[PDB]
Each structure stands twice: as C-alpha cells, then as structure tokens.
C-alpha cells in the first residue's frame, strides 16, 4: 500500500511563497502523474497542476505565472511553489496521485496541509466565563461555558475539567473575526442541581503562542 | 471553460435510505468524470472513475451512471459512514470539481434550548463586550436568530457558528455572539435574542437586564 505524506510551512505572510512537499512512500514517481489540488475554507476542491516529467508541467491557467511543481525523482518526492501569496491562497492543499489513461482519478491522496496566509501577528486568546445563571435553567438543566477570544492562529483546544467531563459538551468551529483574529466558544449542559456543588474549569491551549488557561466557570 | 453542476446541495436522508445524487456538465464529457467522498478534515476518497466504474474496495451499494452531461451516484441503502460531502470531477481539460453535496443524517424535528450569557465583567475591563446566544441540540439545522437592544433589531455586529451533525442523535448546535464595544453596551439596559425554528410553537426569546 502507498502513503503520501506531505510538510511544509503553513502559516505565511502575503508576498511571501508558499512550499509544499509531498513524500511518497510504497511506490515509486515513475509511470504516473503527480499532482495538487487546494480547498478554500468551505468551498470545493480546485485543481492547480500536475506533472509526470521535469519540465513538462500542467498548470491551472490562472495560476502559471505564480505556480512551480517539480519532481525530486532522488527521494521519490514531489513540492509545490507558490509565489506572491495573498490571503486568497489560504486553503487545505493535497497532493495526490494521478495514473495514465484511460484511469484518470486522483488516488491516492496526501492528508492535506492547513495553509493560512495573513498579516496578523501572533496572538494568545483571551478566555471569558460564560456563567451559568437562574434564568439559564431549561427545566433543571443548565449551560455554562467559556469564550476564547482574539487569537491567531489556529488552533486552540479546549477541555472540561481536565478531560473528566466530556458529556454534552459542545466546542464550536472557530469564526474569522473581522479583526483578522479567530474567536471560539465552548459550552456544556449539566445538571442545575451540581451547580452549587461541583466545580467547572475549562482548559485552554494555544500552542502557536505556548498559551495555557484554566478557568474556573462559577454561577451568578 | 466546462461547468460541474450538484443538485441538490444538500441532502437529508435516514439511515437505510436511498439516495442520488446528480452532477450536470455545461457542456458534454463523455464518460471523463469521477464521484469522491470526503468528511470534514480529512482528505477526498475515491469513489467512483470513468462515470460508472467503482474503485476497488468501495461497497457495492453504491454505484453510478450517465454519460455527456448528466450524470448520478446512487446509494441504495445508506449506512451511518457513507454521510459525507460528495464532489464530482471532470477527469480532463482543466479538471474542475462540482460545488458538493453535503449528505446530512434526517432525524426527528427537536426543539432548540436556548441561553443568553452576558459578558463577564473581565472582558469589559478590556473594552468590548461579548454578548452569547446559545442554541443547543436541535434538527432542523435552520434557525433564525435575532438580536435586539431596547428592542432595536441588530444588523452587522453579529457571527454565528454551527457545530456538525453530532454523531450520536444527529442535532445541531448554534452560537451567536453579539459584539459590541464597552461604552456601547454600558448605554443601553435590555439585551435579547430571539430564536425561531420549526420545533418551536413561537419564536422564543431569552434576555436579561445590564
Ligand atoms: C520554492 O521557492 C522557494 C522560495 O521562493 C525557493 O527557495 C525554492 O528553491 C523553491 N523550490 C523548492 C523546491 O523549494
């Protein structure tokens, strides 16, 4: 069986070039094409090029000028070059393989890399209390939970009490705020009648600025 | 420049259900189109090449067919796993992808629970104010949310965020955070939002007082 594993540099400036490899490991480059495809943030798989010999590529016509794919036949890789990158090239890129006619599909694939263009610096996340309350008690059930706040860049991940409480929790996506930062709540159902008796802490973490945050959640 | 059509865009379909899906090209391509399946974070999987013919390993409940510009994949009776977005592919020429379509578990309609937090008073110290609406567990996934200020209908100082499909009872939950800077929310005294969606027998509105 063939695996392709790719790396590569994720978080990048505009202007900057984006460099992706793809390693494939269980077969050789020979005798196929070898190609990528990107995915912007809910939107669909598109093409930009793929090639099967040094120096005859096949490129999305609207990315030639800015795109380089090329073969390391040495280590049986494959990278691609993007240059100029702009806020627009932030997606999940693949790599994949694509064999001779008349089989055409892309199979395998690469695992895909997050690639995040922007001018943000790196930030650490505030974390909020969102507090539990009497007019929050849906026939003795209540919701409390924490608001994690202006940081970049993804991700952050969240627990409750150090992994013990696990159920009905809800951790949402993170949203893009308008301020080029990314925000994120998460809540939990319980019991209203623990509320004076049980403790909720959330835990916090933002590797990207080494950021660790606990915080107590308690009623008002 | 050839189009990939997918209809519908979204799917809701029950367990042991069957479903097609249609892809439709602007323009004929004879048999070059493949069918992937792809779940969130993970990469596309082959399902299907040159129109019709299935990838080795994939279950023999699914299958496809068309030729030109009308083309179906076809589950004949859904399994919890095969819930996923599906995308078509033109195989040559620039190689272009449908939009997708989303095929989502159907379930019973559930009512949201809905909570208002208010901001904490750590965050007004640094000079915003996050207001949260919580809607929790219901199906549908549609539902309007509403802000009002002293009862003034909010617009553009709003985000909303979805969870996926829960894998367990298929219900949704939704976020939606009101924002607004310090002096803006120490101006005004009753902050509501109002929720509706088809569980509910009315629009149901949570508030609280500053
Ligand atoms: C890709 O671009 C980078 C920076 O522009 C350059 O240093 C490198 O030689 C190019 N090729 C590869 C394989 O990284």
């Known amino acids: 069986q063939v695996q392709l594993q790719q790396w590569g540099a994720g978080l990048l400036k505009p202007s900057e070039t984006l460099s992706l490899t793809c390693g494939v490991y269980?077969?050789?480059?020979?005798?196929?094409?070898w190609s990528w495809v990107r995915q912007p943030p809910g939107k669909r798989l598109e093409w930009i090029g793929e090639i099967k010999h040094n120096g005859s590529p096949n490129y999305h016509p609207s990315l030639k000028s800015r795109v380089t794919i090329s073969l390391d036949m040495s280590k049986n890789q494959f990278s691609l070059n993007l240059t100029s990158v702009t806020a627009a090239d932030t997606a999940v890129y693949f790599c994949a393989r694509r064999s001779n006619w008349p089989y055409l599909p892309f199979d395998p694939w690469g695992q895909g890399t997050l690639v995040t263009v922007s001018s943000a610096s790196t930030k650490g996340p505030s974390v909020f209390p969102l507090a539990p309350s009497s007019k929050s008690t849906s026939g003795g059930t209540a919701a409390l939970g924490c608001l994690v706040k202006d940081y970049f860049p993804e991700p952050v991940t969240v627990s409750w009490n150090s992994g013990a409480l696990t159920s009905g929790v809800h951790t949402f996506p993170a949203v893009l705020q308008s301020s080029g930062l990314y925000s994120l709540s998460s809540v939990v159902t319980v019991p209203s009648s623990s509320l004076g008796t049980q403790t909720y802490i959330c835990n916090v973490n933002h590797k990207p600025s080494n950021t660790k945050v606990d915080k107590k959640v308690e009623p008002k | 420049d050839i189009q990939m059509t997918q209809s519908p865009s979204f799917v809701s379909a029950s367990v042991g259900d069957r479903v097609t899906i249609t892809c439709r090209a602007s323009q004929g391509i004879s048999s070059y189109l493949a069918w992937y399946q792809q779940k969130p974070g993970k990469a596309p999987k082959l399902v299907i090449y040159?129109?019709?013919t299935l990838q080795s390993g994939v279950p023999s409940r699914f299958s496809g067919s068309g030729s030109g510009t009308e083309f179906t994949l076809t589950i004949s009776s859904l399994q919890p796993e095969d819930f996923a977005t599906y995308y078509c592919?033109?195989?040559?020429?620039?190689?272009?992808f449908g939009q997708g379509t989303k095929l989502e578990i159907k379930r019973t309609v559930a009512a949201p629970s809905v909570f208002i937090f208010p901001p904490s008073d750590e965050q007004l110290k640094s000079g915003t104010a996050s207001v949260v609406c919580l809607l929790n567990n219901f199906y549908p996934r549609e539902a309007k949310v509403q802000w009002k200020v002293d009862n003034a209908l909010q617009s553009g100082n709003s985000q909303e965020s979805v969870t996926e499909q829960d894998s367990k009872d298929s219900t949704y939950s939704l976020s939606s955070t009101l924002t607004l800077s310090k002096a803006d929310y120490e101006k005004h005294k009753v902050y509501a939002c109002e929720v509706t969606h088809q569980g509910l027998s009315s629009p149901v509105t949570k508030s609280f007082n500053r």
């Open positions: 040159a129109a019709s």
């Open positions: 592919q033109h195989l040559i020429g620039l190689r272009s």
């Open positions: 269980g077969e050789s480059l020979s005798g196929h094409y």
